[PDB]
């Protein structure tokens, strides 16, 4: 899944 700070 996406990193904690992505998007």
């Amino acid at each position, epitope marked *: *899944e*996406l*990193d*904690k*700070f*992505a998007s």
Partner: antibody
Amino acid sequence: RITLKESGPPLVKPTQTLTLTCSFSGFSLSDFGVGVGWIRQPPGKALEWLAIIYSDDDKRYSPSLNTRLTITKDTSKNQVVLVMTRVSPVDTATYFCAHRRGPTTLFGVPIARGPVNAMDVWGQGITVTISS
Amino acid sequence: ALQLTQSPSSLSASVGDRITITCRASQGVTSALAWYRQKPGSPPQLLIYDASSLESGVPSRFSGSGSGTEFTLTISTLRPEDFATYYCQQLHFYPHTFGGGTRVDVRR
């Protein structure tokens, strides 16, 4: 100045449980968005990411090792512990813990996330050998 | 999962050369990529964070560029301490992958 240091047993036998401790200074795991991760390096091989834990207590693990890893923090002791169960010889490696910055804030307002993209300070690493 | 391929895996060079190491990702990782230099017997050391930002205290001969799926680290004037192994790391998707590393050794 941020420093981290790994501690635990240098030798462990197959099927046993390995508990590694990362003790650090210079930051608190209660600071905003900070993370502490674990990375390992079998002799002569590449770095391999294992897990990371943030100050808001979100935890993430390598999918390949998920079932054998537990990461936890002890904020008041400035330590992060990684527990690996059922080790086998292929787990022999040098294990490093490392700091991950949280976003930069201005008057307590997050304004830059670029600094989270790296593990910026590393511990010297602790060599662990798995053999019966 | 996401794959990070470094090139070349090994590279020979001499003091004063300009070298460039590249890292390609199987899916785009935006700018969430870091470069490290690791000398024998020591932990990796952060050189470049967020694809191109120079880490504090890191010498200016190190430079990083690229975003998406292709990144490059270039050392403009190789110094003796640069004979080492370099790694790139992606931090956009979990797990936070490392490339296979590229060994830089003394050419002869």
